[PDB]
């Protein structure tokens, strides 16, 4: 037992990390097959970021201007092209360490692991969630752009995120592997404020089920509620409204613990209205929302 | 910016994970060079764990009785021996994926990454701290024994932990890579209660410095304190007493932020005596103690 914010093993992603340099700017790239994926702002100078015309800037660039280094070995660039906000650099060698992979665009409320990188070298790994307002709350310093988010299904890596920027608010924004930003964010150094970030209700409930499984039961009560009644409370406390689909994904956890989804909603309702009263749940003093129902099942069963 | 419970990239450790089977019991092993390291209770049947005589049990075992599988390939066992609570199985092949490594015995209050494994396959990675009472608060299900804790210094993996057991309290105990348990724990299914777990004071202060660096400054106050005055408060709240050595390791963070170590102690004192008043620090509603001063510097500078 025990419950931790657990990341996927980062090994398959580490072997794909490269360093991409264009002029004075250096950031991370993702090498899969004979292609290196990186944020298009690698062609920008800090000055350009106020309002870059990426098409005009990329015209001044040739294959030899993109230096791609994998550890200590230089990759030869035979092609370059821009797809939305990412650059695709075709190299002459397929990555021998390319794992089975997919490029997927995750839904808000879903979770993923981030392998933070600097100069193409990995520094650490952590679990993240795509917030409902399409930002992530990561840990990224200068040179971390190009670091990727992923999920792993046995041997297949599903890449879902590429880090592009930190907003003036300290929150993070980026793209899927097709170069499309999550949310309304643009790859420009401008005033960009994230919308109201709601709490992911289905993840809080799934984490409450995880607490019941692992011993923490103080928050359970003699009450029940309905989807409409719970949602009045969820709206007051800036929680996502719960749907029948959310109820259904909670099915496995409801069945294992024997606590009805609406009964757990009544426990959540009382915690929202009364707080924790100085108590903790799974070592946290607040309601955790970065564990999906799938994450809880996986951790409580030991899927490798 | 941003601050996360970040684990080391687990790649170098993934390539060392194997599956060790002895009779009906299967757990994880660590393959470095021509040796496989695993918990000695792999020779036990669930019945034996009440009071196992490991020397007597190991006499009934031969090299052919230890089945060691690395993914899909079987390793040939040419030697076996027990060193404290770990078994060392000499195999006929050096692990081609062995990284540069050390075996180190960490101090209480230090942190490490755990690569949780089942049947020799990695499921996830998380950051842990060796508690002052020598237990860890992990996430381990049946079949996770043999999973290891480590730290990484550029290319050298320092293994510090091997998981051996969950106490009836749900907390975890294990050994260093020489088979010596951290704390008073024995590899036996008996009543074993961890001592009083104190909060790691130097890590809370280092995490407070991390909050100041990353924007959260509400907790800073117009007060200061002394080592003796602070320690009266730390003793009341079951915090480790602060020493001049703790003050000195906080030197880099004190210098970067310009906030004197004793001034930050006065902020910590007020948080202990008054709580958070419903506020948060780095997304946490309690005082985090699983980030060492070294972890904070590393994350705030981007060491790969
Ligand atoms: C790779 C993008 C990223 O996360 N960082 C690089 C730039 N950093 C500074 C920054 C912060 C906020 C801004 F509005 C612009 C630049 C932060 C880390
Ligand atoms: C590898 C040891 C471990 O963490 N586990 C295996 C046994 N599990 C059950 C257990 C719990 C508490 C006990 F006192 C004995 C056995 C938990 C996970």
A13-40 burial, b for 16+ CB within 10 Å, e for fewer? Answer: bbbbbbbbbbeebbbbbbbbebbbbbbb
Q: How many Cα atoms within 13 Å fall on the side-chain side of residue A63?
A: 12
Question: Using CA atoms, how far apart are residues A119 and A69, in angstroms rounded to an integer?
Answer: 9
Task: List the structure tokens of A295.
Answer: 């994450």
Documented resolution in Å: 1.7
Question: Using CA atoms, how far apart are residues B1 and A136, in angstroms rounded to an integer?
Answer: 12
In chain B, domain spans: 1-14+100-197, 15-99, 198-301
Question: Using CA atoms, how far apart are residues B114 and B163, in angstroms rounded to an integer?
Answer: 9
- Write out residues with Cβ below 6 Å of ligand 2: B 140-142, 144-145, 163, 165-168, 189
CATH number of A15-99: 2.40.10.10
| DSSP character at residue B134 | S
B39 Cα nearest atom in ligand 2: 1
Question: Using CA atoms, how far apart are residues B42 and B146, in angstroms rounded to an integer?
Answer: 9
**Dihedral angle of Cα A133, A137, A141, A146, to the nearest 10 degrees:** -60
B258-278 burial, b for 16+ CB within 10 Å, e for fewer? Answer: ebebbbbbbbbbbbbeeebee
- Closest partner residue to A123 (CB to CB) among B5, B170, B304 is B304
The SS3 assignment for B241 reads: coil
Q: Residue by residue, what is the 3-state secondary structure of A33-54?
A: CCEEEEEHHHHCCCCHHHCCCH
**Contact A215/B170, CB-based, under 8 Å?**
yes
CB B7 within 8 A of CB B125: yes
CB A109 within 8 A of CB A241: no
- CB proximity under 8 Å: A 150-169 to B: 166
CB B88 within 8 A of CB B32: no
Among A79, A99, A130, A74, CA closest to A16: A99
A172 Cα nearest atom in ligand 1: 4
Looking at beta carbons, which residues of chain B come within 8 Å of A121? Answer: 304
Q: Which ligand is nearest to the CA of B169?
A: 2
Q: Residue by residue, what is the 3-state secondary structure of A173-207?
A: EEECCCCCECCCCCCCCCCCCCCCCCECHHHHHHH
Question: Using CA atoms, how far apart are residues A155 and A50, in angstroms rounded to an integer?
Answer: 41
Q: Which of A139, A142, A168 to mutate to test the pocket of ligand 1 (most atoms within 8 A of CB)?
A: A142
A143 Cα nearest atom in ligand 1: 1
CB B131 within 8 A of CB B121: no
DSSP secondary structure of B156-218? EEEEEEEEEEE-TTS-EEEE-TTSPBSTT--SSSS--------B-HHHHHHHHHHHHHTT--T
Among B129, B139, B177, CA closest to B293: B129
- Closest partner residue to B11 (CB to CB) among A11, A143, A214 is A11
Among A144, A135, A151, CA closest to A8: A151
Find the length of chain B. Answer: 304
User: Under 8 Å CB-to-CB from B247, ≥6 apart: which residues?
Assistant: B227, B261, B262
Q: Which ligand is nearest to the CA of A170?
A: 1
Tell me how far apart the terminal alpha carbons of chain B are, to the nearest angstrom.
16
Looking at beta carbons, which residues of chain B come within 8 Å of A276? Answer: 285
What is the radius of gyration, based on Cα positions, of chain A?
A: 22
Q: Check residue B183 and give left, alpha or beta (phi > 0: left; psi -120 to 50: alpha).
A: left
**Dihedral angle of Cα A80, A86, A91, A95, to the nearest 10 degrees:** -170
Q: Within chain B, how many helices (H) and strands (E) appear? A: 8, 13
Question: Using CA atoms, how far apart are residues A259 and A257, in angstroms rounded to an integer?
Answer: 5
Question: CA nearest A290 in B: which residue?
Answer: B283
User: Under 8 Å CB-to-CB from A267, ≥6 apart: which residues?
Assistant: A208, A219, A220, A221, A223
B219-231 burial, b for 16+ CB within 10 Å, e for fewer? Answer: bbeeebbebeebb
Question: Using CA atoms, how far apart are residues B112 and B9, in angstroms rounded to an integer?
Answer: 12
Question: Using CA atoms, how far apart are residues A25 and B117, in angstroms rounded to an integer?
Answer: 39
User: Under 8 Å CB-to-CB from A53, ≥6 apart: which residues?
Assistant: none
CB A211 within 8 A of CB A271: no
Q: A198-301: same fold as A15-99?
A: no
CB B229 within 8 A of CB B271: no
Looking at beta carbons, which residues of chain B come within 8 Å of A122? Answer: 9, 11, 304
Among B114, B115, B62, CA closest to B89: B62
CB atoms within 10 A of CB A258: 8
Question: CA nearest A15 in B: which residue?
Answer: B11
Active site residue A80: no
Task: List the structure tokens of B197.
Answer: 């777990």
**Beta pairing partners, B197:** none
**Residue nearest atom 2 of ligand 1, based on CA coordinates:** A165
CB atoms within 10 A of CB A217: 13
- Write out residues with Cβ below 6 Å of ligand 1: A 140-142, 144-145, 163, 165-168, 189
Instruction: Tell me, yes or no, if A71 comes closer than 8 A to chain B by beta carbon.
Output: no
Best residue in A3, A5, A7, A142 to probe B by mutation, most B CBs within 10 Å?
A7
Which residue carries 């000499």 as its tokens?
A: B90
CB atoms within 10 A of CB B4: 23
Question: Using CA atoms, how far apart are residues B226 and B265, in angstroms rounded to an integer?
Answer: 8
Strands (E), chain B: 17-22, 25-32, 35-39, 66-70, 73-75, 77-83, 86-91, 100-103, 111-118, 121-129, 148-153, 156-166, 172-175
According to DSSP, the β-strands at B156-166 and B100-103 are parallel
Active site residue B117: no
Task: List the structure tokens of A87.
Answer: 């650059």
Burial class (CB in 10 A: 0-12, 13-18, 19+), A267: buried
Question: Using CA atoms, how far apart are residues A297 and A184, in angstroms rounded to an integer?
Answer: 32
Question: Using CA atoms, how far apart are residues A14 and A22, in angstroms rounded to an integer?
Answer: 22
Task: List the structure tokens of B215.
Answer: 């924007």
CA–centroid distance, A235 to ligand 1, in Å, is: 33
One of 2.60.420.10, 1.10.3470.10, 3.90.1300.10, 2.40.10.10 is the CATH number of A1-14+100-197, namely: 2.40.10.10
CB A113 within 8 A of CB A12: no
Task: List the structure tokens of A134.
Answer: 């399409």
Among A60, A84, A70, A63, CA closest to A31: A70
The SS3 assignment for A146 reads: coil
Instruction: Tell me, yes or no, if A172 comes closer than 8 A to chain B by beta carbon.
Output: yes
Alpha helices, DSSP H, located in chain A: 11-14, 54-59, 201-213, 227-236, 244-249, 251-257, 261-274, 293-299
Question: Using CA atoms, how far apart are residues B283 and B281, in angstroms rounded to an integer?
Answer: 5
Question: Using CA atoms, how far apart are residues B301 and A248, in angstroms rounded to an integer?
Answer: 44
- CB proximity under 8 Å: B 78-107 to A: none
**Contact A7/B123, CB-based, under 8 Å?**
no
- CB proximity under 8 Å: A 257-296 to B: 275-276, 278, 280, 283-286
Indicate if the alpha-carbon torsion angle A253, B283, A283, B144 is positive or negative: positive
One of 2.70.70.10, 3.40.1710.10, 3.30.1540.20, 1.10.1840.10 is the CATH number of B198-301, namely: 1.10.1840.10
Q: Which of B28, B45, B128, B142 to mutate to test the pocket of ligand 2 (most atoms within 8 A of CB)?
A: B142
Residue A79, φ and ψ in degrees, nearest 5: -165, 150
Q: Which ligand is nearest to the CA of A25?
A: 1
**Beta pairing partners, A90:** A35, A79
User: Under 8 Å CB-to-CB from B32, ≥6 apart: which residues?
Assistant: B16, B95, B98, B101
């Amino acid at each position: 037992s025990g419950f931790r914010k657990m990341a996927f093993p980062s090994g398959k992603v580490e072997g794909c990390m490269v360093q991409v340099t264009c002029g004075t700017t250096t950031l991370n790239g993702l090498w899969l097959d004979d292609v290196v994926y990186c944020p298009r702002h690698v062609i920008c100078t800090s000055e350009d970021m106020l309002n870059p015309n990426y098409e005009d800037l990329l015209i001044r660039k040739s294959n030899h201007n993109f230096l791609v280094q994998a550890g200590n070995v230089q990759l030869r660039v035979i092609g370059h092209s821009m797809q939305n906000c990412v650059l695709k650099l075709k190299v002459d060698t397929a990555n021998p360490k390319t794992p089975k992979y997919k490029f997927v665009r995750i839904q808000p409320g879903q979770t993923f692991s981030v392998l933070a990188c600097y100069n193409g070298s990995p520094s650490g790994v952590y679990q993240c969630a795509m917030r409902p307002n399409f930002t992530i709350k990561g840990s990224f310093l200068n040179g971390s752009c190009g670091s990727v988010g992923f999920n792993i299904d046995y041997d297949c890596v599903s890449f879902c995120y590429m880090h592009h920027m930190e907003l003036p608010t300290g929150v993070h924004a980026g793209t899927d592997l097709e170069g499309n930003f999550y949310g309304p964010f643009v790859d420009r150094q401008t005033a960009q404020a994230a919308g109201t970030d709601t709490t992911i209700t289905v993840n809080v409930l799934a984490w409450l089920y995880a607490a019941v499984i692992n011993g923490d039961r103080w928050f359970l009560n003699r009450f029940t509620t309905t989807l409409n009644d719970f949602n009045l409370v969820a709206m007051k406390y800036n929680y996502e409204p719960l749907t029948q689909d959310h109820v259904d994904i909670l099915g496995p956890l409801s069945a294992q613990t024997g606590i009805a989804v609406l009964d757990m909603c009544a426990s959540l309702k009382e915690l929202l209205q009364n707080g924790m009263n100085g108590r903790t749940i799974l070592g946290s003093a607040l309601l955790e929302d970065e564990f999906t129902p799938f994450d809880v099942v996986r951790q409580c069963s030991g899927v490798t």
